[PDB]
Protein backbone atom coordinates (compact mmCIF):
# COMPACT_ATOMS: atom_id res chain seq x y z
CA UNK A 1 0.00 0.00 0.00
CA UNK A 2 2.57 2.49 0.84
CA UNK A 3 4.86 0.36 -0.48
CA UNK A 4 3.00 1.24 -3.76
CA UNK A 5 2.96 5.50 -2.92
CA UNK A 6 6.98 5.03 -2.39
CA UNK A 7 7.37 2.93 -5.50
CA UNK A 8 5.49 5.67 -7.86
CA UNK A 9 7.82 8.15 -5.84
CA UNK A 10 10.96 6.39 -6.60
CA UNK A 11 9.92 6.41 -10.38
CA UNK A 12 9.38 10.46 -10.30
CA UNK A 13 12.40 10.89 -7.81
CA UNK A 14 15.11 8.83 -10.21
CA UNK A 15 13.69 10.47 -13.74
CA UNK A 16 14.01 13.94 -12.40
CA UNK A 17 17.98 12.76 -11.00
CA UNK A 18 18.62 11.78 -14.39
CA UNK A 19 17.36 14.92 -16.41
CA UNK A 20 19.10 17.20 -13.40
CA UNK A 21 15.86 18.82 -12.10
CA UNK A 22 16.79 19.67 -8.69
CA UNK A 23 13.08 21.11 -7.73
CA UNK A 24 11.75 17.85 -8.45
CA UNK A 25 14.23 15.33 -6.90
CA UNK A 26 13.45 17.72 -3.50
CA UNK A 27 9.63 16.98 -3.87
CA UNK A 28 9.73 13.77 -4.41
CA UNK A 29 12.29 13.10 -1.47
CA UNK A 30 10.20 15.33 1.03
CA UNK A 31 6.65 12.88 -0.21
CA UNK A 32 9.28 9.86 0.43
CA UNK A 33 9.82 11.40 3.77
CA UNK A 34 6.29 11.85 4.82
CA UNK A 35 5.16 8.15 3.54
CA UNK A 36 7.84 6.74 5.70
CA UNK A 37 6.87 9.45 8.61
CA UNK A 38 3.48 8.65 8.28
CA UNK A 39 3.63 4.70 8.62
CA UNK A 40 6.11 4.36 11.22
CA UNK A 41 7.19 1.26 10.65
CA UNK A 42 10.53 -0.21 9.74
CA UNK A 43 10.27 -1.45 6.46
CA UNK A 44 8.58 2.09 5.15
CA UNK A 45 11.81 3.43 6.40
CA UNK A 46 14.17 0.96 4.68
CA UNK A 47 12.35 1.63 1.37
CA UNK A 48 12.35 5.41 1.45
CA UNK A 49 16.26 5.15 2.25
CA UNK A 50 16.38 2.94 -1.18
CA UNK A 51 14.88 6.00 -3.45
CA UNK A 52 17.39 8.14 -1.52
CA UNK A 53 20.06 5.83 -2.10
CA UNK A 54 19.22 5.74 -5.58
CA UNK A 55 18.81 9.48 -6.05
CA UNK A 56 22.12 10.30 -3.99
CA UNK A 57 23.90 8.00 -6.79
CA UNK A 58 22.56 9.45 -9.83
CA UNK A 59 23.38 13.16 -8.01
CA UNK A 60 26.50 12.12 -7.62
CA UNK A 61 28.30 10.54 -10.91
CA UNK A 62 25.99 13.87 -12.48
CA UNK A 63 27.71 16.14 -10.46
CA UNK A 64 24.74 17.71 -8.92
CA UNK A 65 25.59 18.98 -5.09
CA UNK A 66 22.23 20.61 -4.36
CA UNK A 67 20.21 16.97 -5.15
CA UNK A 68 23.17 15.02 -3.03
CA UNK A 69 22.45 17.82 -0.28
CA UNK A 70 19.18 17.05 -0.57
CA UNK A 71 19.30 13.22 -0.82
CA UNK A 72 21.63 12.89 2.19
CA UNK A 73 19.52 15.65 3.72
CA UNK A 74 16.91 12.85 4.15
CA UNK A 75 18.82 10.16 4.96
CA UNK A 76 19.90 11.80 7.69
CA UNK A 77 16.12 12.55 8.89
CA UNK A 78 15.03 9.09 8.45
CA UNK A 79 18.56 7.82 10.67
CA UNK A 80 16.68 10.32 13.59
CA UNK A 81 13.50 9.01 13.37
CA UNK A 82 14.15 5.59 13.27
CA UNK A 83 16.07 6.19 16.37
CA UNK A 84 13.20 7.34 18.31
CA UNK A 85 10.42 4.55 17.25
CA UNK A 86 12.45 1.74 15.78
CA UNK A 87 13.26 -0.71 17.84
CA UNK A 88 16.62 -2.66 16.54
CA UNK A 89 17.51 1.12 14.01
CA UNK A 90 20.99 -0.88 13.36
CA UNK A 91 19.60 -1.93 9.75
CA UNK A 92 18.61 1.37 8.47
CA UNK A 93 22.02 2.64 9.59
CA UNK A 94 23.70 0.51 7.74
CA UNK A 95 21.40 1.50 4.43
CA UNK A 96 21.95 5.43 5.24
CA UNK A 97 25.63 4.76 5.29
CA UNK A 98 26.14 2.64 2.62
CA UNK A 99 24.28 5.75 0.90
CA UNK A 100 26.65 7.92 2.03
CA UNK A 101 29.47 5.73 1.34
CA UNK A 102 28.63 5.57 -2.97
CA UNK A 103 28.38 9.26 -2.50
CA UNK A 104 31.63 9.95 -1.36
CA UNK A 105 33.16 7.26 -3.26
CA UNK A 106 31.74 8.70 -6.41
CA UNK A 107 32.30 12.47 -5.54
CA UNK A 108 36.78 11.47 -4.36
CA UNK A 109 36.98 10.15 -7.91
CA UNK A 110 35.78 12.73 -9.86
CA UNK A 111 37.70 15.65 -7.58
CA UNK A 112 33.91 16.97 -6.46
CA UNK A 113 35.27 18.81 -3.19
CA UNK A 114 32.14 20.53 -2.17
CA UNK A 115 30.16 16.49 -2.68
CA UNK A 116 32.68 14.89 -0.46
CA UNK A 117 32.64 17.50 2.31
CA UNK A 118 28.61 16.85 2.40
CA UNK A 119 28.91 13.21 2.73
CA UNK A 120 31.41 13.20 4.78
CA UNK A 121 29.32 15.59 7.11
CA UNK A 122 26.60 13.62 7.16
CA UNK A 123 28.77 10.49 7.82
CA UNK A 124 29.91 12.32 10.98
CA UNK A 125 25.71 13.38 11.96
CA UNK A 126 25.19 9.76 11.35
CA UNK A 127 27.46 8.62 13.43
CA UNK A 128 26.59 11.03 16.17
CA UNK A 129 23.06 9.96 15.94
CA UNK A 130 23.48 6.41 16.13
CA UNK A 131 26.54 6.46 18.80
CA UNK A 132 26.93 2.41 18.44
CA UNK A 133 30.63 1.02 17.67
CA UNK A 134 28.94 -0.43 14.11
CA UNK A 135 27.69 2.91 13.08
CA UNK A 136 31.26 4.46 14.19
CA UNK A 137 33.10 2.02 12.37
CA UNK A 138 31.38 2.18 9.15
CA UNK A 139 31.59 5.95 9.13
CA UNK A 140 35.50 5.77 9.75
CA UNK A 141 35.34 3.05 6.52
CA UNK A 142 33.77 6.19 4.82
CA UNK A 143 36.75 8.66 5.91
CA UNK A 144 39.09 5.87 4.90
CA UNK A 145 37.86 5.24 1.48
CA UNK A 146 37.76 8.82 0.44
CA UNK A 147 41.27 9.94 2.25
CA UNK A 148 42.74 6.92 0.06
CA UNK A 149 40.80 7.79 -3.35
CA UNK A 150 42.14 11.72 -2.62
CA UNK A 151 45.51 10.43 -2.14
CA UNK A 152 45.88 8.60 -4.64
CA UNK A 153 44.11 11.63 -7.12
CA UNK A 154 46.89 14.22 -5.08
CA UNK A 155 43.82 15.94 -3.62
CA UNK A 156 44.60 17.69 -0.99
CA UNK A 157 41.72 19.37 -0.05
CA UNK A 158 39.80 16.54 -0.10
CA UNK A 159 42.80 14.54 2.47
CA UNK A 160 42.81 17.54 4.45
CA UNK A 161 38.81 17.39 4.73
CA UNK A 162 39.15 13.48 5.49
CA UNK A 163 41.45 14.28 8.30
CA UNK A 164 39.17 16.84 10.17
CA UNK A 165 36.21 14.72 9.96
CA UNK A 166 38.34 11.24 10.98
CA UNK A 167 39.12 13.12 14.02
CA UNK A 168 36.11 14.55 15.05
CA UNK A 169 34.34 11.04 14.59
CA UNK A 170 37.20 9.89 17.31
CA UNK A 171 36.30 12.39 19.45
CA UNK A 172 32.33 11.93 19.28
CA UNK A 173 32.91 8.36 20.65
CA UNK B 1 60.57 10.58 -32.31
CA UNK B 2 62.87 12.07 -30.26
CA UNK B 3 60.19 15.19 -29.46
CA UNK B 4 57.69 12.29 -28.67
CA UNK B 5 60.07 12.08 -25.49
CA UNK B 6 61.12 15.45 -25.23
CA UNK B 7 57.56 15.99 -24.56
CA UNK B 8 56.77 13.30 -22.39
CA UNK B 9 59.21 14.48 -20.26
CA UNK B 10 57.15 17.95 -20.22
CA UNK B 11 53.93 16.37 -19.39
CA UNK B 12 55.64 14.34 -16.09
CA UNK B 13 56.58 17.80 -14.93
CA UNK B 14 53.58 19.42 -16.18
CA UNK B 15 50.85 16.41 -14.67
CA UNK B 16 53.20 16.94 -11.24
CA UNK B 17 52.21 20.43 -10.90
CA UNK B 18 48.56 19.81 -11.78
CA UNK B 19 48.42 16.91 -8.26
CA UNK B 20 50.95 19.78 -6.08
CA UNK B 21 48.54 22.70 -7.79
CA UNK B 22 51.04 24.50 -8.79
CA UNK B 23 49.24 26.77 -11.45
CA UNK B 24 52.05 28.35 -12.63
CA UNK B 25 54.52 25.57 -13.20
CA UNK B 26 51.52 23.69 -15.74
CA UNK B 27 51.30 27.10 -17.63
CA UNK B 28 54.90 27.32 -17.77
CA UNK B 29 55.48 23.45 -18.81
CA UNK B 30 52.48 23.74 -21.30
CA UNK B 31 54.06 26.52 -22.79
CA UNK B 32 56.94 24.79 -23.12
CA UNK B 33 54.98 21.55 -24.74
CA UNK B 34 53.83 24.40 -27.22
CA UNK B 35 56.88 25.54 -28.28
CA UNK B 36 58.85 21.87 -28.34
CA UNK B 37 55.68 21.60 -31.03
CA UNK B 38 56.46 25.00 -32.73
CA UNK B 39 60.06 24.38 -33.71
CA UNK B 40 58.75 20.99 -35.02
CA UNK B 41 55.85 22.29 -37.43
CA UNK B 42 54.72 18.96 -38.23
CA UNK B 43 51.34 17.98 -37.27
CA UNK B 44 51.90 14.52 -34.96
CA UNK B 45 53.54 17.15 -32.89
CA UNK B 46 50.76 19.00 -32.22
CA UNK B 47 48.72 16.39 -31.51
CA UNK B 48 50.81 14.71 -29.00
CA UNK B 49 51.02 18.28 -27.44
CA UNK B 50 47.03 18.40 -27.36
CA UNK B 51 47.41 15.08 -25.64
CA UNK B 52 49.75 16.37 -22.88
CA UNK B 53 47.50 19.34 -22.54
CA UNK B 54 44.30 16.94 -22.11
CA UNK B 55 45.95 14.57 -19.29
CA UNK B 56 47.25 17.12 -17.68
CA UNK B 57 43.80 19.09 -17.09
CA UNK B 58 42.06 15.48 -16.45
CA UNK B 59 45.03 15.18 -13.32
CA UNK B 60 44.30 18.85 -12.14
CA UNK B 61 40.42 18.51 -12.49
CA UNK B 62 39.89 15.41 -10.46
CA UNK B 63 43.30 16.98 -7.76
CA UNK B 64 40.82 19.51 -7.34
CA UNK B 65 42.55 22.74 -8.92
CA UNK B 66 40.41 24.81 -10.82
CA UNK B 67 42.71 27.40 -11.76
CA UNK B 68 44.98 24.55 -13.85
CA UNK B 69 42.34 22.88 -15.31
CA UNK B 70 41.59 26.85 -16.96
CA UNK B 71 45.50 27.45 -17.99
CA UNK B 72 45.30 23.83 -19.22
CA UNK B 73 42.01 24.75 -21.63
CA UNK B 74 43.96 28.36 -23.05
CA UNK B 75 47.09 26.17 -24.08
CA UNK B 76 44.90 24.01 -26.38
CA UNK B 77 43.65 27.32 -28.23
CA UNK B 78 47.45 28.20 -28.68
CA UNK B 79 48.08 25.06 -30.15
CA UNK B 80 44.84 25.49 -32.77
CA UNK B 81 46.05 29.40 -33.68
CA UNK B 82 49.58 27.81 -34.17
CA UNK B 83 47.88 24.75 -35.84
CA UNK B 84 45.84 26.70 -38.39
CA UNK B 85 49.54 29.02 -39.04
CA UNK B 86 51.69 26.02 -40.37
CA UNK B 87 49.83 22.44 -40.92
CA UNK B 88 48.25 22.39 -44.24
CA UNK B 89 45.23 20.49 -43.06
CA UNK B 90 44.94 21.00 -39.77
CA UNK B 91 41.47 19.92 -39.69
CA UNK B 92 42.81 16.44 -37.75
CA UNK B 93 44.09 19.14 -34.92
CA UNK B 94 41.23 20.73 -35.11
CA UNK B 95 38.94 17.97 -34.42
CA UNK B 96 41.57 16.48 -31.71
CA UNK B 97 41.20 20.00 -29.62
CA UNK B 98 37.60 20.49 -29.39
CA UNK B 99 36.63 16.63 -28.22
CA UNK B 100 39.56 17.25 -25.75
CA UNK B 101 37.99 21.01 -24.60
CA UNK B 102 34.57 18.33 -24.34
CA UNK B 103 35.96 15.66 -22.00
CA UNK B 104 37.71 18.08 -19.90
CA UNK B 105 34.35 20.14 -19.43
CA UNK B 106 32.98 16.77 -19.00
CA UNK B 107 35.15 16.03 -15.81
CA UNK B 108 34.93 19.44 -14.79
CA UNK B 109 31.28 19.27 -14.72
CA UNK B 110 31.30 16.21 -12.69
CA UNK B 111 33.92 17.83 -10.35
CA UNK B 112 31.63 21.24 -9.75
CA UNK B 113 33.90 23.44 -11.15
CA UNK B 114 31.52 25.63 -13.07
CA UNK B 115 34.71 28.20 -13.74
CA UNK B 116 36.29 25.80 -15.72
CA UNK B 117 33.33 24.87 -17.54
CA UNK B 118 32.82 28.64 -18.45
CA UNK B 119 36.41 28.36 -20.33
CA UNK B 120 35.91 25.70 -21.87
CA UNK B 121 32.91 26.88 -23.67
CA UNK B 122 35.13 30.22 -24.50
CA UNK B 123 37.75 27.76 -25.90
CA UNK B 124 34.99 25.75 -28.08
CA UNK B 125 34.05 29.00 -29.52
CA UNK B 126 37.24 30.99 -30.19
CA UNK B 127 38.19 27.08 -31.91
CA UNK B 128 36.14 27.70 -34.48
CA UNK B 129 36.58 31.44 -34.97
CA UNK B 130 39.97 30.70 -34.97
CA UNK B 131 39.51 27.74 -37.63
CA UNK B 132 37.35 29.44 -39.98
CA UNK B 133 35.86 26.14 -41.51
CA UNK B 134 31.90 24.83 -41.69
CA UNK B 135 33.10 21.46 -40.10
CA UNK B 136 34.82 22.81 -37.24
CA UNK B 137 31.76 25.35 -36.39
CA UNK B 138 29.32 22.11 -36.43
CA UNK B 139 32.52 20.29 -34.15
CA UNK B 140 32.39 23.32 -32.26
CA UNK B 141 28.13 23.09 -31.49
CA UNK B 142 28.25 20.01 -30.53
CA UNK B 143 31.23 20.28 -27.96
CA UNK B 144 28.64 23.01 -26.68
CA UNK B 145 25.24 20.82 -26.43
CA UNK B 146 27.32 18.39 -24.83
CA UNK B 147 28.07 20.60 -22.19
CA UNK B 148 25.08 21.78 -21.95
CA UNK B 149 23.25 18.66 -21.04
CA UNK B 150 26.00 17.39 -18.88
CA UNK B 151 25.16 20.94 -17.07
CA UNK B 152 22.00 20.49 -17.34
CA UNK B 153 22.17 16.75 -15.88
CA UNK B 154 24.47 18.47 -13.11
CA UNK B 155 21.95 21.20 -12.15
CA UNK B 156 24.23 23.94 -12.82
CA UNK B 157 21.97 26.97 -14.61
CA UNK B 158 24.97 28.98 -14.69
CA UNK B 159 26.55 26.40 -17.44
CA UNK B 160 23.59 26.47 -19.37
CA UNK B 161 23.27 29.58 -19.69
CA UNK B 162 26.60 30.50 -20.39
CA UNK B 163 25.85 27.62 -23.12
CA UNK B 164 23.20 29.27 -24.47
CA UNK B 165 25.40 32.60 -25.18
CA UNK B 166 28.15 30.91 -26.71
CA UNK B 167 26.06 28.74 -28.67
CA UNK B 168 24.35 31.71 -30.49
CA UNK B 169 27.56 33.94 -31.19
CA UNK B 170 28.78 30.40 -32.62
CA UNK B 171 26.42 30.59 -34.55
CA UNK B 172 26.55 34.42 -35.84
CA UNK B 173 30.08 34.09 -35.63
CA UNK B 174 30.21 31.90 -38.76
Given at each position: ????????????????????????????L???????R??????????????????????????????V????????????????????????????????????????????????????????????????????????????????????????????????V????????
Open positions: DERRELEKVARKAIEAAREGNTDEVREQQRALEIAESGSEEAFKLALEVVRRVAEVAARAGNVEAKEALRVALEIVKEAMELIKDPEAIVRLALEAVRVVAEVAARAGAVEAVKVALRVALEIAKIAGTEEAVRLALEVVKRVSDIAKKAGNEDAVKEAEERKKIEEES
